[PDB]
Amino acid sequence: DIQMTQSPSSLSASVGDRVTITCRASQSINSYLDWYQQKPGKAPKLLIYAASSLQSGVPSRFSGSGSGTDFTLTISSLQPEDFATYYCQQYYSTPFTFGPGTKVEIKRTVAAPSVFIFPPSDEQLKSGTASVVCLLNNFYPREAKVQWKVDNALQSGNSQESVTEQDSKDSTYSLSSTLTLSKADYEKHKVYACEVTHQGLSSPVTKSFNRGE
Amino acid sequence: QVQLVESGGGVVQPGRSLRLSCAASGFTFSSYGMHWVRQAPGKGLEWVAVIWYDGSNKYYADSVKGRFTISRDNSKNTLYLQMNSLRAEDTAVYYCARDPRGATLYYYYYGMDVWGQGTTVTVSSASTKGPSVFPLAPGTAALGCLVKDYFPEPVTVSWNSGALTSGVHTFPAVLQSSGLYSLSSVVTVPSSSLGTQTYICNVNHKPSNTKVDKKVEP
């Protein structure tokens, strides 16, 4: 089979920018390449076929080039409606393979997250389980790192993270981390701390609480 | 009003089988190749199968070869995908798409130029189950709701019955090792309004016919 790769994984751009993303085939696929645009919760949409031909109805600010193993998709002037994920696809040989996609996101100034930590509720505890939540709110860019400590001991394997899509208004992201324990463990410990790493912060920020205070 | 309409999605236990249908209309179905493409939650597009305009030949992705069968009936304007021996990793939205493949416009016109809307397949052993809703108690304060242990997707969450929308962040759900989903929904409010403003998350889980209104209090 033929392997497709893309680069970069994500890029931050502004309206009016000239955007260029690339696709690479593991072997020559001549001009047998499609480009697609997809927006969250919707079907892909054909932009370019045969490496350089514009699909009917698609704005001319889009274009494509390359042949063989290297291809590019270019948006001459980014419009608000172009912030999306873009995929290449070879149809030179079966099985037909997509690239991993390049997410074109909205650039903004660095914004450090706001950190909140929540103890498990009385109600949850009555049912034998403890969930401790740390919120990283309204930061940019998307790369952020959360870490849990219980009585200064380092947790691993008991947390799960989730991240929002780029907010439409301020273009920030938000992150939720949930530390899940048995009610019995939770009550054998005192200090619960979420430690956050992010470009917007001089040094990591720690939010903590003492159990039952 | 060229249109592809998928159907047949749903929950299915691992090892069991399922059939998707894609009804085509508004064009000459018998002149187009057809693809199935799927997208796992949070993942990119993965190609599943293709079949040519006259059902001549059919090709499959390696991960579904031997287990999936693509077929078509040109007198019913329909494309099918028979899925057997379903595995957890098969869980996705499945799309059908048409592909002229040089049949029209240009001999080099190859591409999926029209897509269906997608139909979700979920492969899991879990039983339908409504969520538990726990409060995340609070110049700006954060509060929220932890929506825990439900199956299947999705839940919808609103605050004060849709009245409160600014500063609301409802995260993507995560699948726990239990096979049950969990998500949280949070909102930041002025610290002043606590005690003066009431905050209630509204959660509904239609597959359980479960509806829960949770007051989130300081």
Residue numbers in the entry:
A (entry chain L): 1 to 213
B (entry chain H): 1 to 138, 146 to 225
Quote the paper:
As the exact epitope and mechanism are crucial elements for antibody drugs, we report the crystal structures of checkpoint molecules in complex with the Fab fragments of therapeutic antibodies approved by the FDA or currently undergoing clinical trials, and reveal the binding modes of the complexes and the conformational changes induced by the antibody binding, thereby providing a structural basis of checkpoint blockade by monoclonal antibodies for the treatment of cancer. In summary, the elucidation of the crystal structures of the checkpoint molecules PD-1, PD-L1 and CTLA-4 in complex with the Fab fragments of therapeutic antibodies sheds light on the molecular mechanisms underlying the therapeutic activity of these monoclonal antibodies. Blockade of the ligand-receptor interaction of these immune checkpoint molecules can directly enhance the function of T-cells, which represents a critical paradigm shift whereby checkpoint blockade aims at disinhibition of the activity of T-cells compared with the previous immuno-oncology concept, whereby cancer vaccines and cytokine therapies aimed at de novo activation of immune responses. Monoclonal antibodies blocking immune checkpoints have demonstrated unprecedented therapeutic benefits in clinical trials and provided a major breakthrough in oncology.
Tremelimumab is a fully human IgG2 antibody that blocks CTLA-4. The CTLA-4/tremelimumab Fab complex and free tremelimumab Fab were crystallized and their structures were determined and refined to a resolution of 2.0 Å and 2.3 Å, respectively. As the HCDR3 loop conformation in the complex is essentially identical to that of tremelimumab Fab alone, other CDRs and framework regions of tremelimumab likely contribute to the conformation of HCDR3, implying that antibody context is important for the proper display of the tremelimumab HCDR3.
